[PDB]
C-alpha cells in the first residue's frame, strides 16, 4: 500500500454502482469507503466479484497477496490485466494520462542546491582555535578545600545572627503571644491592612542585590518539618498569621503601590515576605506588651515557596542516615570542634539545603562525587569546580554553598578517602 497510487485508485472508482445503488469499488485509501474491521489486501476492493485489485507499474511488483488482481500500467500508454473487465475499466477511466509521481529519495538534489552551497560558502566560517594542553594530576587535597572556604569567608564574612534559619527553633512564646507579636510587627512596618490581611506595598526598587553574608548555624532545627509545612501552607494562605503546634509565621503579599487604583489581591506572580519568630538576642528584636522575639524575614517568589514547601525533611534525613559515616560535632561556623561542637547542627545544614531554592549543594555534591571516584584530574581545572559563588546570589544560597564546602572539608579531615 503506497499513497502514490491513492489518487489513481480514486479515478478507477468513478460512480460505479452495483446491486442497484451500492457502490461497487471501495478504495483502500478512502476513509469512508473502507470497510471497518476488514484487513486491506489491495488498492481497492470489488464487492460485485469480491476481489482485491492492485495497480502496478511495469517491472515494479508490489507486496500484496498473490490472489490480488494486478493491473500493470505499461511504460507505453497501455493497461494490461488478467481480468478483462478490469482491463476495459482501466482503459476507459484512465483517458487522461495519470502519471504516477516517482519516489523522492532523501539524497534528492534540488535545482537550488548549488546556489545555497555558494551562499553557505560566502557566509562566515569558524577559526581553528587552540589545542588545549592537559596535565593530569591527583585530585585536590584538603588544603585546596580549606583555601576555598577561607576565600569565601574572607570575601563575604558572617552575619551576627542566623536570620530566618533561627526560625528552625522555638521562639519561646505561646500561640497568642506569637500572633500578637507578628501582627504588631506588621503594623509597626506600616504594612497595609485590608480585608483582614496584611499587604506590603512598594513603589521603587534600588535595582541592586541585597547584602550577602554567611549565616552562622543555630544549635539545632527541631521545627524543620513544621517550618517547611508552614511555608507550604503559606503558598495561598497569605496575609494572615499561620499557626503550627510549636511556631507560626506570617506571609505578606508584596504588591506595587500604584496609587488610588492599585492591586488589592495577589495574583499568580505575586511574591511573599515570610516573617518568622525566633529567640531574642539580635538586632532584629521586637518587643510588645513585654513579649520579646527576634523577627526575621525572607523574600520568596511562588516557585521558590512551592519548592521549599514540597520537601520532606524526615525521609531525606533517614535515607542519608542509611549509609552514613559518623558525623562529627561542628561549631557555629561549620568548623570541627570536638570540645564544644554539636552534631545536631548537621540537621540545621539539611534544613538550609531545603530552604535554598537554587540547590547549589547539589552541584557541590556532584563535584565531590567526581572527586572521590577520581584517580587523576586536569591541573588547575578540577579545583575550579568548587568555585560556584558566581553561579548563585543571596544569603541563603551563599551560606548553603559555604556549608557544603565545609562538609567536604570535614569529610576530608575526619574520614580521609
Amino acid at each position: 500500500m503506497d499513497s502514490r497510487f491513492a489518487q489513481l485508485t480514486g479515478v478507477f472508482c468513478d460512480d460505479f454502482t452495483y446491486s442497484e445503488g451500492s457502490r461497487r469499488f471501495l478504495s483502500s485509501y478512502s476513509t469512508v469507503e473502507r470497510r471497518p474491521g476488514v484487513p486491506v489486501e489491495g488498492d481497492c476492493y470489488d464487492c460485485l466479484k469480491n476481489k482485491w485489485i492492485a495497480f502496478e507499474l511495469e517491472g515494479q511488483p508490489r507486496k500484496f497477496p498473490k490472489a490480488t488482481v494486478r493491473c500493470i500500467l505499461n511504460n507505453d500508454a497501455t493497461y494490461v490485466c488478467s481480468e478483462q473487465e478490469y482491463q476495459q475499466i482501466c482503459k476507459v477511466q484512465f483517458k487522461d494520462y495519470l502519471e504516477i509521481d516517482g519516489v523522492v529519495k532523501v539524497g534528492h538534489k534540488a535545482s537550488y542546491d548549488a546556489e545555497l552551497r555558494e551562499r553557505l560558502l560566502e557566509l562566515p566560517h569558524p577559526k581553528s582555535g587552540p589545542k588545549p594542553r592537559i596535565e593530569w594530576v591527583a585530585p585536590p587535597r584538603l588544603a585546596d578545600i580549606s583555601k576555598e572556604t577561607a576565600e569565601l569567608k574572607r570575601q563575604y564574612g558572617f552575619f551576627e545572627c542566623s536570620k530566618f534559619l533561627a526560625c528552625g527553633e522555638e521562639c519561646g512564646l505561646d500561640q497568642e503571644a506569637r500572633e500578637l507579636i507578628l501582627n504588631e510587627y506588621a503594623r509597626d512596618r506600616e504594612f497595609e491592612f485590608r480585608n483582614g490581611g496584611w499587604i506590603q506595598r512598594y513603589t521603587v526598587a534600588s535595582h541592586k542585590p541585597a547584602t550577602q553574608k554567611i549565616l552562622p548555624l543555630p544549635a539545632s532545627a527541631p521545627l524543620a518539618r513544621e517550618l517547611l509545612m508552614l511555608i507550604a501552607r503559606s503558598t495561598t494562605q497569605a496575609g494572615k498569621v499561620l499557626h503550627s503546634d510549636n511556631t507560626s509565621i506570617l506571609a505578606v503579599p508584596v504588591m506595587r503601590d500604584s496609587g488610588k487604583h492599585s492591586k488589592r489581591r495577589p495574583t499568580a506572580s505575586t511574591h511573599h515576605l515570610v516573617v518568622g519568630l525566633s529567640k531574642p538576642g539580635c538586632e532584629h528584636d521586637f518587643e510588645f506588651d513585654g513579649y520579646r522575639a527576634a523577627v526575621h524575614v525572607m523574600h520568596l517568589d511562588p516557585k521558590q515557596s512551592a519548592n521549599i514547601g514540597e520537601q520532606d525533611f524526615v525521609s531525606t534525613r533517614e535515607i542519608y542516615k542509611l549509609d552514613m559515616l559518623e558525623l562529627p560535632p561542628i561549631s557555629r561556623k561549620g568548623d570541627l570542634d570536638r570540645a564544644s561542637g554539636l552534631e545536631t547542627r548537621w540537621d540545621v545544614i539539611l534544613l538550609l539545603e531545603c530552604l535554598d531554592s537554587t540547590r547549589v549543594s547539589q552541584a557541590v555534591a556532584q563535584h565531590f562525587n567526581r572527586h572521590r571516584l577520581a584517580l587523576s584530574v586536569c591541573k588547575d581545572e578540577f579545583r575550579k569546580g568548587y568555585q560556584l559563588a558566581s553561579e548563585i546570589r543571596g544569603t541563603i544560597p551563599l551560606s548553603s554553598l559555604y556549608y557544603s564546602l565545609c562538609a567536604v572539608r570535614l569529610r576530608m579531615t575526619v574520614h580521609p578517602f
Binding site: 474491521g37 500484496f64 497477496p65 498473490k66 514547601g309
Partner: protein
C-alpha cells in the same frame, strides 16, 4: 465551520493532524498539588465517591506466592515482554462496540527494561520490586515445568523433558519446501506467507498463532492452501535429542532445521533465554538449525551479520561453528536475511575495523577474541594496579569474570572473557 478555520485553505488533512487538533487542552496550574487537591474539597469528594461506588466493584487480584533462592550478581537489564492484542482480537473488540482508540492503544506488543542485580539458579524473571526476595513471574504438571527447564530433573521419555518422541500435549511447527506444517497430534495444518499475512486453513489453531507470532505475520484464512508431501506423522512418531537450553522468547525449543516444539500450556518464556553463562551453549545448539530470531542485537542486524561474516573468514572450525550459531540466534525467521555464513558476500568494510563487536541482549562480545579462543579456551587478564585493594578476594585457580587480587604477582587483576563464566563445563 471549525474545519474551515483550523485548516483554512485546505479541504483534506491527515487523520494524525485532525486527531492532534482535537486533543483537550490542559493548563499548568501554578498551585501546588496539595492546594489543588484541597480546592473545593475535590479530593475529599473523589475519595468519598471511590469508597462508596468504585471500590466494591474492584476485582480481587491473586496474591504472589512463588519464590526462589537468589544471589547478588552484576547489574543486568531484565526484559519484561507484555504482548499486545492480536489483529483478530482487536477487530472483534471493535465490532463489539468497544472504544477504537483504547483497542488501538493495546494493539502493540511492549518490551520494558528494568535494571536488577539478582539472579536465581534457573535465570528466572522477577516481579517488579521483588527481585531481592526471589518472587518469580513463573507459576509452579511435571512435564509443563520440565519443558521450560534447560536441564529437566526427571526425564519422562518424551521430547519435552529429554530425548524422545512427541507427546499429546506437545505440538510442532516445521518448514518443508515452501510451506509451514503445524502438527499437534489430532490436527495437521499448512500455512504460507503471501505478502504480509500468514495464510492458513485454520488461523485460530494455537500452533498457527504461535507460528504467526514467530514469523511476525498477520494470520489470515485461505482455504486454497495445500502441500504435496507431509512427513508430519513420521516426525511425530520419531525421537529427537533435546538440546539443554531455556525456551526462546517465543516459548518454543528447536528440534531440527527450522523446526520448533511448543507446549500447549507454556505460553511465553518466563525466564531469561540469553544470559552470560548460556550464550555460547545457545549458539552451539542452533549451529545448523537456521535462523531462530530468539536474541535481540543492539544496532543493525545487517551490520552484526557483516561483522560475523568478517570474523568467519578467519578462524578455526570451532570458532566458525560458534559464529554461525550466533548468526542464527540473531537472525529473524522468514525474513530476507542471509544468515548462513557460507553464501553471504564478504564485506571488505567490516575487515577495515580492528575490533569486531556485537551486542546480543546486552552482552558485548568481541568476535576477534572469539576467533582467538578467549571465551571458551583461556581468559583475558588486565592488570589494574600493583597495590592491594580492600574488600577484594584472592585470585582463584580458574578465575571467573571479575576483580581479584593475585598474591603471586601482588597485583589487582580484572578477568574477562573467562571460560569459567561463559563455558562452565559443569
Amino acid at each position: 465551520s471549525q474545519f474551515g478555520k483550523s485548516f483554512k485553505g485546505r479541504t483534506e488533512v491527515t487523520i494524525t493532524e485532525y486527531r492532534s487538533h482535537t486533543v483537550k487542552d490542559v493548563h499548568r496550574s501554578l498551585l501546588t498539588a496539595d492546594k489543588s487537591l484541597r480546592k473545593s474539597f475535590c479530593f475529599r469528594n473523589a475519595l468519598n465517591q471511590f469508597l462508596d461506588k468504585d471500590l466494591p466493584l474492584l476485582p480481587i487480584r491473586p496474591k504472589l506466592e512463588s519464590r526462589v533462592a537468589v544471589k547478588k550478581s552484576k547489574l543486568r537489564s531484565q526484559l519484561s515482554f507484555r504482548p499486545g492484542l492480536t489483529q483478530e482480537e482487536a477487530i472483534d473488540l471493535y465490532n463489539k462496540g468497544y472504544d477504537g482508540d483504547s483497542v488501538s492503544g493495546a494493539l502493540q506488543d511492549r518490551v520494558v527494561n528494568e535494571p536488577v542485580a539478582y539472579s536465581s539458579a534457573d535465570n528466572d524473571k522477577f516481579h517488579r520490586g521483588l527481585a531481592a526476595l526471589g518472587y518469580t513471574l513463573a507459576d509452579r504438571d511435571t512435564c509443563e515445568s520440565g519443558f521450560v527447564r534447560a536441564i529437566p530433573t526427571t526425564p519422562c521419555g518424551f521430547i519435552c523433558c529429554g530425548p524422545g518422541s512427541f507427546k499429546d500435549s506437545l505440538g510442532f511447527v516445521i518448514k518443508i519446501g515452501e510451506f509451514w506444517h503445524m502438527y499437534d497430534g489430532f490436527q495437521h495444518f499448512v500455512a504460507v506467507e503471501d505478502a504480509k499475512f500468514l495464510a492458513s486453513k485454520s488461523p485460530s489453531f494455537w500452533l498457527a498463532k504461535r507460528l504467526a507470532k514467530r514469523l511476525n505475520l498477520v494470520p489470515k484464512e485461505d482455504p486454497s492452501v495445500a502441500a504435496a508431501e507431509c512427513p508430519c506423522k513420521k516426525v511425530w512418531e520419531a525421537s529427537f535429542a533435546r538440546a539443554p537450553t531455556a525456551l526462546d522468547p517465543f516459548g518454543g525449543r528447536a528440534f531440527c532445521d527450522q523446526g520448533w516444539v511448543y507446549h500447549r500450556d507454556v505460553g511465553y518464556a518466563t525466564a531469561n533465554h540469553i544470559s552470560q553463562e548460556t550464550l555460547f551453549q545457545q549458539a552451539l545448539s542452533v549451529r545448523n538449525l537456521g535462523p531462530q530470531g530468539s536474541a535481540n542485537v543492539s544496532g543493525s542486524i545487517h551490520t552484526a551479520l557483516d561483522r560475523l561474516r568478517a570474523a568467519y573468514s578467519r578462524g578455526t572450525p570451532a570458532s566458525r561453528s560458534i559464529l554461525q550459531g550466533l548468526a542464527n540466534l540473531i537472525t529473524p525467521v522468514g525474513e530476507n536475511f542471509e544468515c548462513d555464513l557460507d553464501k553471504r558476500k564478504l564485506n571488505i568494510k567490516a575487515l577495515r575495523s580492528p575490533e569486531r563487536y556485537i551486542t546480543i541482549e546486552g552482552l558485548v562480545v568481541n568476535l576477534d577474541d572469539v576467533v582467538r579462543g578467549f571465551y571458551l579456551d583461556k581468559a583475558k587478564v588486565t592488570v589494574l594496579s600493583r597495590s592491594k585493594w580492600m574488600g577484594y578476594e584472592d585470585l582463584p585457580q580458574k578465575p571467573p569474570n571479575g576483580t581479584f587480587y593475585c598474591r603471586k604477582r601482588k597485583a589487582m587483576l580484572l578477568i574477562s572473557c573467562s571460560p569459567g563464566t561463559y563455558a562452565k563445563k559443569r
